[PDB]
């Protein structure tokens, strides 16, 4: 999936910004970083 190697300052950061990145609407902090799962 989308692994930008970005630590999670909250899963709610990635889920919003990862939208602007690619084309996804879903990102979660699972392994300590924000991974996007489209």
């Amino acid at each position: 999936q989308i692994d930008t190697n970005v630590k999670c300052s909250g899963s709610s950061k990635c889920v919003k910004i990862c939208i602007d990145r690619y084309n996804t609407r879903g990102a979660k902090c699972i392994n300590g970083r924000c991974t996007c799962y489209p």
Side-chain angles (χ1 to χ4, degrees), residues 5-23:
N5 194 85
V6 175
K7 289 62 169 294
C8 62
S9 177
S11 304
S12 310
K13 183 173 275 79
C14 20
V15 58
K16 180 181 61 179
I17 190 45
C18 199
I19 302 178
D20 190 82
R21 294 178 178 170
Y22 297 101
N23 63 325

Side-chain angles (χ1 to χ4, degrees), residues 19-36:
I19 302 178
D20 190 82
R21 294 178 178 170
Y22 297 101
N23 63 325
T24 180
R25 35 59 195 144
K28 179 187 176 182
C29 173
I30 179 61
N31 60 334
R33 75 173 67 171
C34 278
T35 308
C36 313

